[PDB]
């Protein structure tokens, strides 16, 4: 016979990180195997065609990564100019849009996200003098290039990716989600936010009564997001993990050449410097087989990782489509609570979603009854249940508390008062009072 109805609400903002892509690499057999050796090159040619498959697989992986990035980020072919003002009815859109003070083409949060996670070796512009042709301490990157291992840059640059996020965020503040299904439709932000509250079962009037509180809570949550990101260093873990995995795989592949397998020496120059070719062929064969086995293992692992990244990118693209360009009623799909809107943020080899939700709180104690009997007839509520104070009765919502008098337009009449259990005596307001 009791019921709990919340009387207050709070606005909470949560974050979520999904990897979108990984690095692209290429392998040359004639350089990794039989480095600067004509006889070994001829022997490898005689061995057979065991290297075209590796190149085809690597090219397919690179194309798949590019396609994943394009599908995740490039979805709407319309660039919307950032508005000059960044205050829409008390809501502060300052930490999500780029600052025109400096042409960095990135927002305040995106700079922190980029600086939080590091990269192995950016640029891909290393020349002689930057490798052992000049002077180094034998860096890993130059060692990789000495054995035919190269890393290709992504098709889309960092600046171009941030442009998509800037267009997506700006479009939301000007049209909501109408531009995702077609052309843009201008609408005030205060009225746009009102119908977001309407989709979660809450009446429209509550937003206008407490607009200032909602705006203050939203701004406070947005500001606290930066502090939470600064104070912690474990949220951005998946990108670091995948970068470290790729780097470790490349380093292990490079350092695997030290093993001589069943031969007499890992070096190939000395073998040809002391043995005849009829005896050197046996020594070379086992080295060739071992190096080919290592390359095959690396390619298989890369293919498996590419499949996993493809699945993750598909999930991220689906979430972006169903959570940013619209409102989703799926439970725990866009955070905790009732989803209102989402903001996309670019991350290195990933994407970050900012989910704004509605969370009720401050419950109160009340009693309820199933139905109401007026005169031999039972009345059932249309939107809500019956509450009671001090021998009284009212009809209110569930996500918010707002009592109202029981009238004939709030309850439909059906059935008698005998079959229903728990029905009680009560009167119903007569519309024909002033008559």
């Amino acid at each position: 016979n009791s019921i709990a109805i919340p009387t207050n609400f709070s606005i909470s903002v949560t974050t979520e990180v999904l990897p979108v892509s990984m690095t692209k690499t290429s392998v040359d057999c004639n350089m990794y195997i039989c480095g600067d050796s004509t006889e070994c090159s001829s022997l490898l040619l005689q061995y057979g065609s065991f290297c075209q498959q590796l190149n085809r697989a690597l090219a397919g992986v690179s194309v798949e990564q590019d396609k994943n990035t394009q599908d995740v980020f490039a979805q709407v072919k319309s660039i919307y100019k950032v508005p000059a003002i960044k205050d829409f009815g008390g809501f502060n859109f300052s930490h999500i849009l780029p600052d025109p003070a400096k042409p960095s083409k990135r927002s305040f949060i995106e700079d922190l996200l980029y600086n939080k996670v590091t990269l192995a070796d950016p640029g891909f512009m290393k020349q002689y003098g930057d490798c052992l042709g000049g002077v180094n301490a034998r860096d890993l990157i130059c060692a990789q290039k000495f054995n035919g291992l190269t890393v290709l840059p992504p098709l889309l640059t960092d600046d171009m990716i941030a442009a998509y996020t800037s267009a997506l965020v700006s479009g939301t503040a000007l049209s909501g989600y109408t531009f995702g299904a077609g052309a843009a439709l201008q609408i005030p932000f205060a009225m746009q936010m009102a119908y977001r509250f309407n989709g979660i079962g809450v009446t429209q009037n509550v937003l206008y009564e407490n607009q200032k509180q909602i705006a203050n809570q939203f701004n406070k949550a947005i500001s606290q997001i930066q502090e939470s990101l600064t104070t912690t260093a474990t949220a951005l873990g998946k990108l670091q993990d995948v970068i470290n995995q790729n780097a470790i795989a490349l380093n292990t592949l490079v350092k695997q050449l030290s093993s001589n397998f069943g031969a007499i020496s890992s070096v190939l120059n000395d073998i040809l410097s002391r043995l005849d070719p009829p005896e050197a062929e046996v020594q070379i064969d086992r080295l060739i087989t071992g190096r080919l086995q290592s390359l095959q293992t690396y390619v298989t692992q890369q293919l498996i990782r590419a499949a996993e990244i493809r699945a993750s990118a598909n999930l991220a693209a689906t979430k972006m489509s169903e959570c940013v360009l619209g409102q989703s009623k799926r439970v725990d799909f866009c955070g905790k609570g009732y989803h209102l809107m989402s903001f996309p943020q670019a991350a290195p080899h990933g994407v970050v979603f900012l989910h704004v939700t509605y969370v009720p709180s401050q419950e109160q104690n009340f009693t309820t009854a199933p139905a109401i009997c007026h005169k031999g007839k039972a009345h059932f509520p249309r939107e809500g249940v019956f509450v009671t104070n001090g021998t009284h009765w009212f009809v209110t919502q569930r996500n918010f508390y707002q009592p109202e008098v029981i009238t004939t337009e709030n309850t439909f009449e059906s059935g008698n008062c005998d079959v229903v259990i728990g029905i009680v005596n009560n009167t119903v307001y007569d519309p024909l009072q002033p008559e």
Binding site: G89, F124, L152, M160, L174, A184, Q186
Partner: protein, 96 residues
């Protein structure tokens, strides 16, 4: 069109070994008539650069793409290099 990845094409002669290659590569090793322009990934040789932006046809890297033109009036049969276009621009304004 040959793209020498991971090198500055100011230093092609000290990298391509001009003195130990055929004259065909000597053609692709000299900066004459704007045939060498530095990109973000490398420096492309054998193609002409163009302004504006078009849809990407042959991916290259770092926002650069390539395409082949068949021109009869200008007698142009070379490769073009350009930056891909993000998309068309809109002019939707805010109002309360």
């Amino acid at each position: 069109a040959v793209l020498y990845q991971d090198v500055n094409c100011t230093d092609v002669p000290t990298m391509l070994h001009i003195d130990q290659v055929s004259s065909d590569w000597r053609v692709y090793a000299a900066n004459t008539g704007g045939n060498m322009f530095q990109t973000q990934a490398g420096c492309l040789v054998g193609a002409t650069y163009d302004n504006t932006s078009y849809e990407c046809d042959i991916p290259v890297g770092a926002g650069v793409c390539a395409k082949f033109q068949i021109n009869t009036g200008a007698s142009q049969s070379s490769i073009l290099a350009y930056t891909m276009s993000l998309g068309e621009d809109s002019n939707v304004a805010y109002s309360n």
